Design a protein around this ligand. Structure first.
Ligand SMILES: *[C@@H]1O[C@H](CO[C@@H]2O[C@H](CO)[C@@H](O)[C@H](O)[C@H]2NC(C)=O)[C@@H](O[C@@H]2O[C@H](CO)[C@@H](O)[C@H](O)[C@H]2NC(C)=O)[C@H](O[C@@H]2O[C@H](CO)[C@@H](O)[C@H](O)[C@H]2NC(C)=O)[C@H]1NC(C)=O
Ligand SMILES: *[C@@H]1O[C@H](CO)[C@@H](O[C@@H]2O[C@H](CO)[C@@H](O)[C@H](O)[C@H]2NC(C)=O)[C@H](O)[C@H]1NC(C)=O
Ligand code: NA
Lengths: 180, 199
């Protein structure tokens, strides 16, 4: 379809956590989503949150419709479960690496289904839980998902990192290695 | 400045099942096209496309919904109105800050450290933190454009409303050779050049 821009609401509901997601993307970047537990609209960029709004309750209403629609299709499909499509994983820095200068490591997890994952960062084989952030489960046009994980870090010659991903399509955890 | 949304239709009657939807607005040359997709797991089974003007089953699972919903005139009228209401409304409220967002690139040039694993001698123009995604990167050697021996990553989405790309020149440097990477992007008034000299 020819388009200068594509503006898309995407939402899903499923049996396992996260059991619902409701978001709006503009040229494939997530602009806002509804936090289903807080019942609030969350804006990705602060200046957008300052200029625009969205009524969270319409998101919540659509999650309730989609849950109705899920119950209907479970019955109509005779409980067809999809195959588990495992992720492709890439790790890369946000900025060119300069030792001793702060940067951000990105773990991009792509082309997977369903949107059920565990991801963690390791540094020198140990868990890292601070300076970490993650995106939503982001929709793809082929109805699989992608996701980003982030780690703020200061590169150093001796350190090594892994992005460690678990998904039902994988026989064992996938460790994607990175070093400066 | 409030975005309009739209209610999906409520269709009529480890273990995981999933249902997802899309409500897509395609803006092009003063026009809007609206698609609403209903998806069970990874199977889109029914869709409304404003260019068709009614529900179409995409798959056999969608057969009953096409038949029913297309004889509901009030629902069809609501779906046919979405391009001029929700799509247009949301497109018009964004302003320049949305439709003309610009974030200037940073440009770094350095030799690849990865020769043993790449098997090629590559000079890397790493262009980071930019938006929108369209960009052009050119290489020059002593002022002459080099069009052979250039390879690039895909345009890489960072997920944070910026992009990066790495554009690599395969080089056979001689002392005195001066390489230039030139970046052209709509956020810049003039192109950005960065020079690297063969040591
Ligand atoms: C982008 O839009 C302009 C829009 O003008 C359109 O005029 C049509 C009336 O016949 C309407 O059907 C359409 O909805 C209307 N919209 C608006 C917002 O005005 C297109 O240019 C117009 O094209 C028609 C041919 O369809 C011509 O008779 C009109 O005089 C012309 N209007 C003006 C002001 O120039 C434009 O169409 C492309 O450009 C020209 C026509 O100028 C032709 O080369 C092409 O046929 C046409 N291309 C295509 C692929 O249809 C639209 N551009 C594009 C890229 O689609
Ligand atoms: C993410 O991790 C959780 C916790 O380890 C996994 O859920 C457990 O899986 C075990 C062992 O297979 C089950 O026997 C437990 O009952 C599960 N616990 C809970 C609370 O569900 C989960 O499988 C992992 N997710 C993925 C995609 O690998
Ligand atoms: Na809110």
């Amino acid at each position: 379809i020819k388009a200068d821009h594509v503006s898309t609401y995407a939402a899903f509901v499923q049996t396992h956590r996260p059991t619902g997601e409701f978001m709006f993307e503009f040229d494939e970047d997530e602009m806002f989503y509804v936090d289903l537990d807080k019942k609030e609209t969350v804006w990705h960029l602060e200046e957008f949150g300052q200029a625009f709004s969205f009524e969270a309750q319409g998101g919540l209403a659509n999650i309730a419709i989609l849950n109705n629609n899920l119950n209907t299709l479970i019955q109509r499909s005779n409980h067809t479960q999809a195959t588990n499509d495992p992720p492709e994983v890439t790790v890369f820095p946000k900025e060119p690496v300069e030792l001793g200068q702060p940067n951000t490591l990105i773990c991009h997890i792509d082309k997977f289904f369903p949107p059920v994952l565990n991801v963690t960062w390791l540094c020198n084989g140990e868990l890292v839980t601070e300076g970490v952030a993650e995106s939503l489960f982001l929709p793809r046009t082929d109805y699989s998902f992608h996701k980003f994980h982030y780690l703020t870090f200061v590169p150093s010659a001796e350190d090594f990192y892994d992005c460690r991903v678990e998904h039902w399509g994988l026989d064992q955890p996938l460790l994607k290695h990175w070093e400066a | 400045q409030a975005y309009d949304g739209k209610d999906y239709i409520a269709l009529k009657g480890p273990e995981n099942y999933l249902f997802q939807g899309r409500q897509e607005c395609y803006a092009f040359n003063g026009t809007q096209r609206f698609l609403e997709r209903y998806i069970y797991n990874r199977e889109e089974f029914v869709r409304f496309d404003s260019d068709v003007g009614e529900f179409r089953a995409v798959t056999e699972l969608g057969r009953p919904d096409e038949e029913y919903w297309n004889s509901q005139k009030d629902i069809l009228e609501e779906e046919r109105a979405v391009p001029d209401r929700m799509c247009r409304h949301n497109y018009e409220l964004g302003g320049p800050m949305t439709l003309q967002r610009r974030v200037q690139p940073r440009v770094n040039v350095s030799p690849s450290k990865k020769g043993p694993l790449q098997h090629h001698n590559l000079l890397v123009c790493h262009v980071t933190d930019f938006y929108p995604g369209s960009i052009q990167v050119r290489w020059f050697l002593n002022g002459q454009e080099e069009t052979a021996g250039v390879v690039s990553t895909n345009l890489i989405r960072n997920g944070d409303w910026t992009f990066q790309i790495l554009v690599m020149l395969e080089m056979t440097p001689q002392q005195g050779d001066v390489y230039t990477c030139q970046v052209e992007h709509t956020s810049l008034d003039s192109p950005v050049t960065v020079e690297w000299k063969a040591q």
